[PDB]
Design an enzyme around this catalytic site. Structure first.
Site, PDB file in Angstrom:
ATOM      1  NE  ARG A   1      42.532  10.938 -17.311  1.00 27.24           N
ATOM      2  CZ  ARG A   1      41.417  10.595 -16.688  1.00 27.24           C
ATOM      3  NH1 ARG A   1      41.076   9.358 -16.422  1.00 27.24           N
ATOM      4  NH2 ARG A   1      40.597  11.586 -16.205  1.00 27.24           N
TER       5      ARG A   1
ATOM      6  CB  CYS B   1      30.779  -1.924 -12.987  1.00 25.95           C
ATOM      7  SG  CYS B   1      31.254  -0.199 -12.652  1.00 25.95           S
ATOM      8  CG  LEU B   2      28.244  -2.933  -7.184  1.00 27.71           C
ATOM      9  CD1 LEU B   2      28.460  -2.468  -5.748  1.00 27.71           C
ATOM     10  CD2 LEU B   2      27.117  -3.943  -7.169  1.00 27.71           C
ATOM     11  N   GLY B   3      27.939  -0.054 -10.884  1.00 25.56           N
ATOM     12  CA  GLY B   3      27.425   1.092 -11.618  1.00 25.56           C
ATOM     13  C   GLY B   3      27.288   0.947 -13.107  1.00 25.56           C
TER      14      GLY B   3
ATOM     15  CG  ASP C   1      38.427   9.819 -14.219  1.00 31.06           C
ATOM     16  OD1 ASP C   1      38.345  10.694 -15.095  1.00 31.06           O
ATOM     17  OD2 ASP C   1      39.364   8.988 -14.211  1.00 31.06           O
ATOM     18  CB  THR C   2      33.884   5.463 -15.146  1.00 34.80           C
ATOM     19  OG1 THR C   2      32.591   5.849 -14.612  1.00 34.80           O
ATOM     20  CG2 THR C   2      34.859   5.011 -14.068  1.00 34.80           C
TER      21      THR C   2
HETATM   22  C1  HEM Z   1      31.997   3.402 -18.426  1.00 31.89           C
HETATM   23  C2  HEM Z   1      31.800   3.167 -17.171  1.00 31.89           C
HETATM   24  C3  HEM Z   1      32.515   2.321 -16.152  1.00 31.89           C
HETATM   25  C4  HEM Z   1      33.494   1.407 -16.291  1.00 31.89           C
HETATM   26  C5  HEM Z   1      34.147   0.985 -17.638  1.00 31.89           C
HETATM   27  C6  HEM Z   1      33.770   0.825 -15.011  1.00 31.89           C
HETATM   28  C7  HEM Z   1      34.638  -0.237 -14.800  1.00 31.89           C
HETATM   29  C8  HEM Z   1      34.733  -0.884 -13.613  1.00 31.89           C
HETATM   30  C9  HEM Z   1      35.766  -1.913 -13.344  1.00 31.89           C
HETATM   31  C10 HEM Z   1      36.631  -2.460 -14.501  1.00 31.89           C
HETATM   32  C11 HEM Z   1      35.575  -2.347 -12.098  1.00 31.89           C
HETATM   33  C12 HEM Z   1      36.324  -3.492 -11.368  1.00 31.89           C
HETATM   34  C13 HEM Z   1      37.662  -3.100 -10.802  1.00 31.89           C
HETATM   35  C14 HEM Z   1      38.460  -4.226 -10.190  1.00 31.89           C
HETATM   36  O1  HEM Z   1      38.016  -5.379 -10.379  1.00 31.89           O
HETATM   37  O2  HEM Z   1      39.507  -3.791  -9.633  1.00 31.89           O
HETATM   38  C15 HEM Z   1      34.581  -1.499 -11.475  1.00 31.89           C
HETATM   39  C16 HEM Z   1      34.140  -1.570 -10.145  1.00 31.89           C
HETATM   40  C17 HEM Z   1      33.285  -0.692  -9.520  1.00 31.89           C
HETATM   41  N1  HEM Z   1      32.623   0.358 -10.167  1.00 31.89           N
HETATM   42 FE1  HEM Z   1      32.782   0.890 -12.072  1.00 31.89          FE
HETATM   43  N2  HEM Z   1      32.976   1.412 -14.040  1.00 31.89           N
HETATM   44  C18 HEM Z   1      32.202   2.358 -14.723  1.00 31.89           C
HETATM   45  C19 HEM Z   1      31.193   3.123 -14.160  1.00 31.89           C
HETATM   46  C20 HEM Z   1      30.854   3.139 -12.819  1.00 31.89           C
HETATM   47  C21 HEM Z   1      29.861   4.043 -12.193  1.00 31.89           C
HETATM   48  C22 HEM Z   1      29.030   5.055 -12.977  1.00 31.89           C
HETATM   49  C23 HEM Z   1      29.887   3.793 -10.896  1.00 31.89           C
HETATM   50  C24 HEM Z   1      29.029   4.306  -9.710  1.00 31.89           C
HETATM   51  C25 HEM Z   1      28.812   5.624  -9.586  1.00 31.89           C
HETATM   52  C26 HEM Z   1      30.895   2.728 -10.654  1.00 31.89           C
HETATM   53  C27 HEM Z   1      31.080   2.084  -9.465  1.00 31.89           C
HETATM   54  C28 HEM Z   1      31.783   0.922  -9.220  1.00 31.89           C
HETATM   55  C29 HEM Z   1      31.850   0.165  -8.004  1.00 31.89           C
HETATM   56  C30 HEM Z   1      30.997   0.530  -6.752  1.00 31.89           C
HETATM   57  C31 HEM Z   1      32.738  -0.796  -8.166  1.00 31.89           C
HETATM   58  C32 HEM Z   1      33.180  -1.915  -7.194  1.00 31.89           C
HETATM   59  C33 HEM Z   1      32.308  -3.152  -7.172  1.00 31.89           C
HETATM   60  C34 HEM Z   1      32.745  -4.253  -6.227  1.00 31.89           C
HETATM   61  O3  HEM Z   1      33.879  -4.207  -5.714  1.00 31.89           O
HETATM   62  O4  HEM Z   1      31.950  -5.209  -6.084  1.00 31.89           O
HETATM   63  N3  HEM Z   1      31.481   2.453 -11.865  1.00 31.89           N
HETATM   64  N4  HEM Z   1      34.065  -0.673 -12.412  1.00 31.89           N
END
Ligand code: HEM
EC number: 1.14.15.1
Length: 405
Positions: free
Chosen positions: A177, A348-350, A242-243
């Site tokens: 943001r 998302c891994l997380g 941030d998420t």
């Molecule tokens: C409400 C919670 C969350 C949402 C809505 C969210 C959403 C997403 C989205 C939409 C992507 C894909 C982005 C793309 O395709 O460009 C992504 C990837 C990722 N997120 Fe999250 N996320 C959240 C929480 C988290 C948390 C808590 C972590 C870890 C601390 C995290 C770690 C990651 C990682 C490591 C990836 C990349 C996976 C890969 O490339 O295989 N996220 N997430």
């Protein structure tokens, strides 16, 4: 500041949406983006804001683009271009097959088994924070719970000092943001300045924390380099800070206005999981995209090599072709369709961590503070970007209606 329409873009396809400052933000962020799905808007548009890019507006299209890494590349996943260009996070800036090794490692750190292991801390912190708020009859949910809860859990997992929060959070915010205070490259750089020393330290003297595991990991039989760990951690960082933080505020603002949804969860607890999914659908908040690797004709529109397209994960489940009465929250839907946590090889891994944090918050909040509302005369403001947010959320409640546990 609209950018000159490129030669290949039909004038009829133009729709000047600003992902950073949409038009009816007052109405809510999800509502402001949803203007893209009105009958007057073609399925694939071109906006002249933020230098010019495509936006897919429907679930079908977002999913296809996500599956299609050959045509839609993660190399440059952020808009504007300078941002996407400077973006070098792993695994997010990589396409298969390359992505897969780094993904395997990131999973070791954030995966299922880690959540299972941290479960008791998650529950411990939630209960502590809530019990502490309870007697007050009033908080700032964003600053009082939505920030502390998720971030402290992450600082723990990452083995980083809680004193670094303020600093790290500001930088993380600047990336999703943007404020105008700093460019993306500057922000990425400061975060990187932070990490470097820390990774160095953990390569020499390994811990059991997330950073230590990343910095000492193996990728493709060989050892991860330093720049590589720096780049993975930088992502974990934004994901951590941030998420979950933003999502809880959307969901809590909703609960604050819907006594009947609160009650539903109180009497029929078996529904929390279902409810959590429904909120993930309605209060979806991430929008990123991909870059054209070549000229390609997608749903009869001609995409040119180098064109960026925003594939809003947020829009999928808000699409009526996907969910009947999309703007309406219904915990009993037969099928909750969304791409909140993405789609394709980048899921998302997380997500597992995120879900556990949500489910705990709901259960534990409702147990202690069953009845609450938005403070009288507070105007809740949303913010748009790569990750959308709530500015502040003042809640009020009668301590006499609470329940100590
Ligand atoms: C409400 C919670 C969350 C949402 C809505 C969210 C959403 C997403 C989205 C939409 C992507 C894909 C982005 C793309 O395709 O460009 C992504 C990837 C990722 N997120 Fe999250 N996320 C959240 C929480 C988290 C948390 C808590 C972590 C870890 C601390 C995290 C770690 C990651 C990682 C490591 C990836 C990349 C996976 C890969 O490339 O295989 N996220 N997430």
């Amino acid at each position: 500041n609209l950018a000159p329409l490129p030669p290949h873009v039909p004038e009829h396809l133009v729709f000047d949406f600003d992902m950073y400052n949409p038009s009816n933000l007052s109405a809510g962020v999800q509502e402001a983006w949803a203007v893209l799905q009105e009958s007057n808007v073609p399925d694939l548009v071109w906006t002249r804001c933020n230098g010019g890019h495509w936006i897919a507006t429907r679930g079908q299209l977002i999913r296809e683009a996500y599956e299609d890494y050959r045509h839609f590349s993660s190399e440059c996943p952020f808009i504007p271009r300078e941002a996407g260009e400077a973006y070098d996070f792993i695994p997010t800036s990589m396409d298969p097959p390359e992505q897969r090794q780094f993904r395997a490692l990131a999973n070791q750190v954030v995966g299922m088994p880690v959540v299972d292991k941290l479960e008791n801390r998650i529950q411990e912190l939630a209960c502590s924070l809530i019990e502490s708020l309870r007697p007050q009859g009033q908080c700032n949910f964003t600053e009082d719970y939505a920030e502390p809860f998720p971030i402290r859990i992450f600082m723990l997992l990452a083995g980083l000092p809680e004193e670094d929060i303020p600093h790290l959070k500001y930088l993380t915010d600047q990336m999703t943001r943007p404020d105008g205070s700093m460019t993306f490259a500057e922000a990425k750089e400061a975060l990187y300045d932070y990490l470097i020393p820390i990774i160095e330290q953990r390569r020499q003297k390994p811990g059991t924390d997330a950073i230590s595991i990343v910095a000492n990991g193996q990728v493709n039989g060989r050892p991860i380099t330093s720049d590589e760990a720096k780049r993975m951690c930088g992502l974990l960082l934004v994901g951590g800070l941030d998420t979950v933080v933003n999502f809880l505020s959307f969901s809590m603002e909703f609960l604050a206005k819907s006594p009947e949804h609160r009650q539903e969860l109180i009497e029929r607890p078996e529904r929390i999981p279902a409810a959590c999914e429904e909120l993930l659908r309605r209060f979806s908040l991430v929008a990123d995209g991909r870059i054209l690797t070549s000229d390609y004709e997608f749903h009869g529109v001609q995409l040119k090599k180098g064109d960026q397209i925003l594939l809003p994960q947020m829009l999928s489940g808000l699409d009526e072709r996907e969910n009947a009465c999309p703007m309406h929250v219904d915990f009993s839907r037969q099928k909750v369709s969304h791409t909140t946590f993405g789609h394709g090889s980048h899921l998302c891994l997380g997500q597992h961590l995120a879900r556990r944090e949500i489910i705990v918050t709901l259960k534990e909040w409702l147990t202690r503070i069953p009845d609450f509302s938005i403070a009288p005369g507070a105007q809740i403001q949303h913010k748009s970007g790569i990750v959308s947010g709530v500015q502040a959320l003042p809640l009020v409640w009668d301590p006499a209606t609470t329940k100590a546990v």
